[PDB]
Structure formats: C-alpha cells, structure tokens
Ligand binder design. Structure first.
Ligand code: ADP
Ligand code: BEF
Ligand code: MG
Ligand code: ZN
Ligand code: ZN
Ligand code: ZN
Ligand code: ZN
Lengths: 374, 607
DNA sequence: ATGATATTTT
DNA sequence: AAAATATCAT
C-alpha cells in the first residue's frame, strides 16, 4: 500500500527533449474548399429582424469574461452597427427575456441610433429570473405583424440558459410562427436544447443549420457577423411584389425649419418627392405619405449579394504564370514550393493573397473584369 | 578566452567580462545564463522551459534572490551534494545544464560539479539496538578510513558521544557520510499503525516536498524549507505516517508543542493511547508498545540540572530506539547546547522543518552534517499566487524624531540609545493611527515589541493586552484563544516569545514599534505570523506588515539590514513618509509639549 | 566577553 | 518568588 512518494521522482525535464509555408497553403486550400462553392442564391434584401437577448441568472456565469451579459450586450452593439451598414433598408427590434417575462426595449424601426441607445441602457440592468422563449416569441410575433408583407420576418434569439419556463404550450407558438412565415435563428451558449432545435428546424423549412452553439469567445463574433447577411428563400415560398418608393433631394436652407418626423428645428433635411415634407435622416418611411424614402446608394450596397463575385482558384505550380507581379496592387509573388497566384476565371488574371481576401470581402468587383474591354 | 578582442568598456567589469564565449545559435530558447568565474546562474522565468528549469535548478543550486522575472541561483559544494543524493549523477546534471544554458558551460564550472558528484555512497552509517555501526559493503575503502587517527564488509561500533565528530570528519574527507534508512526492511522495532484521515488531502507542493525525501522509496534525513503557513506540520505528520515507526517530535516552545499535539490529532488516525507530551506542564509518558512523543529542545538538551521525575522520562526517551525524529524549527539546532539532542536520541531518520533557514553566525551550514542536506524549498511568491499563503503589502513607516527628543539621543550612550527612539512620541502617534485605521476595517492587528518596557508602556496607554516571559502559560493561552474568537479584543501586543512557531489565522495586520538588533530571522518569522490568514482566498485581499522606525537613528540602519531576507525572497518594502489623515485624528498621544517633556523625563529615569 | 530576554526548577 | 542555564544579539 505504498504511496506515490515512494515510487519514483517525476523527472519533468525528461519529458522535454532536444514545412510551415506549405502547411499554410494546404490549410488555406482546405479553408478555400468551403468557399469554392458559391451560387447567386436569391436573398431578401428588405428584412425585419427582432433581436431577442437572454437576461437571466444564466447570464451571471463567468464562462465569457467578464460575464455573459456584458459580452452579449457589447457584441450586440457591434451587430447593430454592422447590420444597418450592410442592410440600410431593413428595420430591427430588440427584446429581452428577464424575470420570466419578455420586455420590449425598442420599437421596431429603421434607426440604428435608437437600437444602440436601448442596448446601452440595458448595460447596467442586472439579469435575474428565468428565461421564457414563448413570451419572447409571442412578443416577437406581435411586433412582426404590422411589417409589410414583402419584408421577410426574422427572429435572432440569443439563448444562454438550458431550461425554459413557459406559461403555455410552446409547441403551439412554433406552429403559429410557421403560419406567419417567421424564421428563427438561435445562438446557444452552453449546450443543445430540444425545444430550441425544434423551433429552428420547424421555422427554417426543416433546415437544422440555423441552431448554433459557440465553443469559445472568438466563435461568438463569427456567429454574430454571419447573421448580418440576408438569408436565402425557398422556391415554394412566393413573395414577389413591387414596393413604391422615392428618392428625395438634399435641400440646403439658411433658416432652420420644423421636421415632420420629430417636429424639431433642423438646419437641413431631405424633401419628400410626394408631399414635400422634410425628414431629418434617411432611410426612413415618410412621416406623412408613408412611402419609404431612400438614396440610390442604399440600393447599391445590396447589389453584391445578388451577384456575388466567383471565388478564385489557385493556379497549379507547373503551369506558367501570366506575369511576375500582381495585376491590381503590383506586389511581386514570392519565389518560395507552391506558387501563390490566384487567377479570376472570367478574365484569367493572377492576384495575390491580399487581393484575394480584399476582392471578396470589401471590394466587390474584380479589377481585371472591369478592365477587360468587351 | 582565446581569439577574443577585449571591449573598449571592458575596464568597467573587474575581470568579470564573459564576452569571450560566444552566444549559442538557439539562445532565444535556452532559459539559463551561466557565469564561469562566479558560478552564478541567471534564469528567465518568462521564457519557455521555465517550470522544469526552476525545479531542476533548485535541486542543483541554492536560491539567492528570486524576483518576479529574473532568478539568481548559485552552485555550491553542499548544493551539489544534495543534488547527487536524490537519485542523480554527474552525467545527467551536465547534460541538462548544458542543454538549458544559453552559452556553453566553461571548463571551470564543469570541474566544480564533477568533483563532488562521485562521493555519494561510499561510507554508510546504521543504528543497531543502541550501538552505531559505521559500516560499508566493501572492505577496502573502510580500511583506508580506519587508518586515520581522527576516527576512533566491515562494521565497527563507534562511541555515541563522538558521533558528531566523525560526521563532520567525513564531510572534511573526500567521502561524506550518507544518511539513509530502509524502514520497510526492518521490523524488529515495534511499528506504529497510523495513517492520514480520509478527509485529509496533501497539497501539491507538500506532496512534491515529501516526494523528494522518499524519492528512492527509502526515508533519508534532510531539511524541508517551506514558507510560514505552508503547512510543515502536515508534511511532518505525513512523513511520520509513511515510515510507520516510533516518532519523536522536538519543538521550540511548549505552546507550539500543544499545537503539534492538536494538529497531529486533527490530521491523523493516532489515538491518545500512543501520544504523550514531555513538557513542563505535564511529564506524562506513553506506556504503549510504541507511539508519538512530543517534547521541547530545552527539556531534552538540558544536561546539568533536571528533576528526577523528568529524569525518568528522559531515560525513557534515551532507552528505546526510535524510527523517526522531527526537529521542528531546525534553525536553532546549531545552537551551542541544542546540538546534543541529535546525539542523545538515537533515530534512524531525522527530518528538519523550518521556514527561515537563516542564522547570523556561520553555524547555519553545520545543519548539513547534523541532520541532512536541504532536500526541498519553495518560492514564497509562487505559493502566494496559488493562494496558499496570504499576500502581504509590507511597509516601513518613517517616524521623524522631534527636536527635544533628538538632542537627548546624541549625548546618551549606545545601550541607553535604544530607549530614546523606541519611545519616540512621533512613533507612538504612528502606532496609534495605524491601529485605529486598521481596526475600523475589522482587521486583527498584532504589535510586536522586543523591548519589554516599551511593550508594556504602549499596551497600558492603549488599554490592550500583552504577552511575554513573565506571563504564565495559562494566561498566555487564554489571551491567544480569546483574541482568536472575540470581537471586542481585536488587537494584542506580543514580545520575543511569540516571534516564532505560533499559529493564529485571525491575525491579518501587523506592526512593530520596536525590534531586536539587525536580524533577518525575526523579521521573516514575525511576517509569517499573518501569512496563514483563513481569509486569504477572498478576492482583492491584502494583509499588511508595518515597521515603525525613527529617522536618523540607528534603527534605520538595523531595519534596512533586518529585511534583507524578505527582499531576497521577493517581498518589497515601501517607504511611507507621510500618513494621510493623521492630523484630523481628534486625539493624539503626547500632542502637547508638556506631555513630551514628561515622557522624556520618565524614559530617561529608566537608566 | 556582556546585557536582554526566555525558560525550567526548587 | 528566587536560582540557574540557554539563547539571541552587541
Ligand atoms: N493541506 C492543508 N489543508 C488545509 N489547511 C492546511 C493544510 N496544510 C496546512 N494547513 C494549515 O496551515 C496552517 C499552518 O500550518 P503550520 O504547520 O503551523 O505551518 P508552519 O509551516 O508555519 O509550521 C494551519 O492552520 C493548518 O491547518
Ligand atoms: F513557519 Be511557521 F510559522 F512555524
Ligand atoms: Mg511551525
Ligand atoms: Zn426630425
Ligand atoms: Zn412624403
Ligand atoms: Zn495584389
Ligand atoms: Zn476577373
């Protein structure tokens, strides 16, 4: 019955005793494999998203430093900014589950400032009680009723607990959501939940990829950023329609005038092309003739989604190269094992790694394709 | 040093320049620098291979200074002897050191380790019924040893009294004496059946420290150094349990003897039948076949005059052969008379446990041949991070001496000089303010004072208790227990009696109005009194350690010299010239000039 | 070598 | 309550 002391000494120093570039390429190729498949799926540019956040005792856990409540709220602010930058026409609403009830914190609108301010106020609020998915969903269902039909209803629940206390049968709400054509995306924090999986699958036409649980702090940001982009629509669902809209002209005035939207003195504004009423900022529904005023730039931002730029394929090392320098940025390709040259299929012009990421994330048009004369 | 151009600024380094050796190509990885001439080692704890390097260096080197980032180690003959003792050889040591060195090891260093790594196991000493036999399996080597006139398979009985003489002599000769005892093999000595309680669990560093002692599966004598509050009592208890033989404990003070009795009972399976305490309070002795006997150094070490009732128990101690002996607070063993305890009591394995292996004289090194090599050591900073010993924010308050008081200081003689600055009215105000401020925070404060007269004077003025030699054992225990479990009595003064070997988790703050002459041992021991606070794991908690001194007096000289050990271990002292909020205090002692003059006359009348 | 302080005994 | 021996520092 001897103890571990008598056996031997650990001898820690015995444990320690005394290709990267190709590894990066193959790792990039494996990552690029997921990006190889891309097709112009039809996506609803106009959308209405109700953001539901869990503010309950489960948020007091220190899994995400400093606490789940702080990180979720902070990343929510970033999501609000990103969501309204990529999609200018869309509107958003904020709900929070606290004390076993769903509490509205900001009306569904198209002003990012209002939603940002609402989230900022929630910072100090201390989470408590149990969450209630049914109460949040019922409140979300009501909020998404006045929204126009052409808009695609969307719910993005950030669930953090493992159990839900509802006053009624949540299964009825799931059926009701499907009837109203509402798609729910759930970002779990700890582990899978049976009801959450069913809600996402039922509302997403059987797709099970809309319920995701993160595995570390870094993965949360990627999940938040993914929801920014619009979701594709199914073939069976039909929502084709026209929407009346107008483009107002910025007007400069020496004397400030009352704004129809807020009834406040503002030096400048945009004159509506129907009722000539002035609105402080865009894009918002006109306060008088309720036609959504927008600028041509707002429509432009969403064009790249309709016709995404085809992914580039790395050239084989054996084949010859078009030139020794990048077409766009003129950066010499390192001589190095495997050539680090990427060519666009349409125009067949090589590009560097920096251009490949830039030409598919920020810049949405291949420089070579525009240069090619037809 | 060949084909090397001396540097222009090489003159700044007094022959200590080491630029001749070239840096290794992989210097970015190796964490060690080796200085050839001085033998010092510089270790980077922020670089890869830090943890196992620290464990290895501690084994083969005695730490000197261990700040946060750069650790300064040194190699000595005694350190090498300890390293080779715990299952190591020159081949392994050389390979590891060269591997971890940012620069190649110089030939001078290689020779130093090589010489002392081969004499490990030539001469052995064993203990039979009551006769010591210095024997060895081989027969040729001992014949050379016997030829020497200093000493006076082969086995020969040596005089018990002269055992220390041969032990030192073996250290002097090339072959040093080894102290190993195979407790598993021998069953002739009655075995005590004891084991740790199921609830008890050994902490990581405690487990590692005990593992080194039993690395080869056989107990070996040595000294284990852990910070105050680390739990050396549990390490000793576990060491006794595994050996499964009779164990005798020698302790510095009777109060601590009671602590050992209680601690031993709380953390093991032993029953009262096998426990007896040979202290001044009671001379009860155990009549069981075997058991634990806990005593004190003074009782055992005393030679001339001991009562017959104590003599019979002492004869009982010397009669039976013991299997284990724990020399608690082993930093006083090298004293003139306490050394006799090792010789009188015949034990196969002897273990020393202390927190501050410091001694003003050169007698500290003698421990290596009285008990054994320094088996293990632990970093005070490392344990503080782990949450085992409470963090302490040391400070050194500067208390200026007033003009009237200072003038009398210069004229008085040296021995009278001490009482002028210890009773400084400015120091008195500082002590009052700190106690009042820290009592508001609900913190227990212990005010040490070596000077008995000053201790009493401060206590009487503040209406607080005190403990020192005149206090009886019953009263001293009552104050200790009361101060631990009563809200009203938040602060108690003490003296040299309580400096070392007392457990009191309640204490969190600490002050010293006066202190003994420059001595690092007392400073470290007093600081350790508050390093085991039960509320050490609470978030954002910091214990306090205040040192009140008088500016321009000899106390400043002593205080700087009195905190050297703490600086080496890692603690940093902050100078507090001004105590904010002191002026607003409604009442301050000796505020009026008349009060200061009256105190000056009173203190002057002392001598 | 001396002075403090502490401890043990009678 | 007084003796006597150790210890720790000059
Ligand atoms: N493993 C442990 N678990 C809990 N408390 C422990 C453990 N080991 C030691 N302690 C505590 O450490 C404190 C000081 O122990 P002690 O042996 O008196 O320290 P020192 O090293 O100063 O002699 C005691 O309160 C004891 O209960
Ligand atoms: F090191 Be301890 F306080 F006995
Ligand atoms: Mg102790
Ligand atoms: Zn307005
Ligand atoms: Zn209008
Ligand atoms: Zn480029
Ligand atoms: Zn192209």
């Amino acid at each position: 019955g001897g103890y571990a002391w008598e056996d031997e000494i650990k001898r820690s120093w015995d444990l320690v005793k005394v290709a990267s570039l190709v590894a990066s390429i193959v790792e990039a190729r494996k990552k690029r494999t997921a990006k190889k498949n891309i097709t112009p799926y039809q996506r609803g540019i106009i959308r209405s998203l109700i953001l539901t956040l869990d503010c309950s005792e489960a948020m007091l856990e220190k899994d995400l430093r400093p606490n789940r409540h702080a990180m979720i709220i902070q990343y929510a602010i970033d999501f609000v900014h990103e969501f309204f930058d990529q999609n200018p026409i869309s509107q958003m609403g904020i709900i929070i589950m606290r004390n076993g009830l769903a509490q509205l914190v900001s009306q569904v609108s198209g002003n990012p400032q209002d939603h940002i301010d609402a989230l900022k106020s929630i910072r100090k609020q201390e989470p408590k009680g149990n969450p209630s998915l049914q109460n949040a969903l019922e409140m979300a269902r009501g909020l998404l009723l006045p929204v126009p039909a052409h808009c695609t209803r969307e719910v993005l629940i950030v669930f953090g607990s493992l159990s839900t206390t509802d006053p009624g049968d949540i299964h009825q709400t799931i059926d009701s959501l499907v009837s109203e054509k509402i798609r729910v995306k759930v970002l779990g924090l700890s582990a899978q939940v049976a009801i959450c999986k069913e809600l996402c699958k039922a509302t997403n036409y059987g797709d099970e990829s809309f319920y995701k649980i993160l595995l570390d702090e870094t993965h949360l940001k990627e999940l938040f950023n993914e929801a920014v982009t619009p979701l594709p629509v199914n073939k069976i669902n039909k929502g084709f329609t026209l929407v009346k809209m107008g483009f107002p002209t910025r007007i400069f005035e020496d004397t400030p005038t009352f704004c129809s939207c807020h009834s406040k003195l503002v030096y400048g504004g945009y004159f509506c092309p129907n009722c000539h009423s002035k609105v402080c900022s865009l894009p918002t529904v006109c306060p008088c003739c309720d036609l959504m005023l927008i600028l041509s730039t707002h429509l432009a931002r969403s064009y790249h989604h309709l016709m995404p730029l085809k992914t580039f394929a790395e050239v084989p090392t054996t084949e010859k190269f078009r030139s020794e320098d990048c077409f766009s940025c003129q950066s010499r390709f390192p001589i190095l094992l495997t050539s680090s040259r990427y060519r666009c299929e349409d125009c067949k012009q090589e590009f560097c790694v920096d251009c490949d990421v830039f030409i598919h994330e920020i810049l949405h048009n291949c420089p070579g394709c525009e240069s090619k004369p037809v | 040093p060949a084909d090397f151009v001396p540097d222009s600024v090489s003159g700044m380094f007094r022959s200590h320049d080491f630029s001749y050796l070239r840096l290794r190509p992989d210097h970015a990885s190796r964490p060690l620098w080796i200085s050839p001439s001085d033998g010092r080692i510089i270790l980077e704890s922020f670089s890869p291979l830090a943890e196992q390097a620290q464990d290895f260096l501690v084994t083969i080197a005695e730490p000197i200074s261990r700040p946060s980032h750069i650790h300064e180690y040194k190699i000595t003959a005694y350190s090498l002897y300890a390293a080779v003792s715990v299952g190591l050889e020159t081949d392994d040591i050389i390979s590891v050191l060269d591997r971890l060195s940012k620069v190649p090891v110089a030939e001078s260093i290689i020779n130093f380790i090589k010489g002392a790594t081969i004499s490990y196991g030539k001469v052995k000493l064993v203990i039979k019924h009551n006769r010591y036999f210095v024997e060895t399996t081989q027969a040729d080597i001992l014949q050379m040893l016997l030829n020497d006139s200093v000493i006076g398979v082969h086995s020969f009985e040596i005089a018990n009294e002269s055992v220390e003489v041969v032990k030192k002599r073996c250290q002097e000769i090339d072959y040093p004496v080894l102290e190993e005892y195979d407790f598993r093999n021998d069953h002739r000595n009655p075995d005590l059946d004891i084991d740790l309680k199921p609830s008890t669990q050994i902490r990581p560093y405690q487990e590692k420290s005990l593992s080194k002692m039993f690395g080869n599966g056989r107990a070996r004598s040595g000294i284990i150094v852990l910070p105050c509050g680390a739990g050396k009592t549990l390490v000793g208890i576990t060491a006794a349990c595994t050996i499964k033989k009779s164990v005798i404990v020698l302790c510095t003070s009777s109060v601590s003897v009671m602590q050992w009795r209680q601690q031993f009972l709380q953390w093991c399976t032993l029953q009262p039948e096998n426990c007896a305490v040979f202290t001044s309070d009671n001379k009860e002795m155990f009549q069981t076949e075997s058991g634990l006997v806990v005593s004190t150094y003074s009782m055992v070490a005393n030679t001339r005059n001991r009562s017959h009732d104590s003599q019979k128990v002492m004869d009982f101690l010397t009669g039976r052969e013991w299997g284990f002996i724990i020399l608690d607070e082993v930093h006083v063993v090298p004293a003139a008379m306490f050394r006799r305890v090792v010789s009188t009591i015949a034990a196969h394995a002897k273990l020393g446990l202390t927190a501050t292996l410091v001694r003003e004289d050169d007698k500290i090194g003698d421990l290596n041949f009285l008990i054994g090599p320094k088996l293990y050591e632990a970093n005070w900073m490392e344990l503080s991070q782990k949450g085992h010993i409470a963090n302490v924010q040391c400070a050194e308050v500067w208390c200026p001496m007033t003009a009237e008081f200072y003038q009398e200081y210069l004229r008085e003689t040296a021995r009278k000089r001490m009482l002028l600055y210890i009773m400084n009215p400015t120091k008195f105000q500082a002590c009052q303010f700190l106690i009042q401020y820290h009592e508001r925070r609900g913190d227990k404060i212990i005010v040490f004072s070596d000077n008995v007269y000053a201790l009493q004077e401060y206590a009487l003025k503040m209406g607080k208790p005190f403990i020192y030699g005149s206090t009886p054992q019953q009263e001293r225990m009552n104050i200790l227990q009361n101060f631990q479990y009563n809200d009203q009595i938040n602060t108690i003064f003490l003296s040299k009696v309580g400096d070392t070997s007392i457990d009191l988790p309640e204490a969190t703050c600490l002050i010293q109005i006066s202190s003994h002459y420059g001595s690092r041992r007392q400073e470290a021991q007093r600081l350790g009194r508050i390093l085991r606070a039960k509320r050490r794991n609470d978030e954002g908690f910091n214990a306090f350690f205040y040192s009140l001194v008088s500016k321009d007096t000899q106390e400043m000289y002593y205080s700087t010299k009195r905190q050297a050990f703490l600086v080496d271990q890692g603690y940093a002292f902050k100078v507090i010239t001004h105590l904010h909020g002191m002026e607003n205090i409604p009442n301050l002692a000796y505020a009026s000039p008349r009060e200061r003059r009256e105190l000056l006359q009173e203190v002057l009348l002392k001598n």
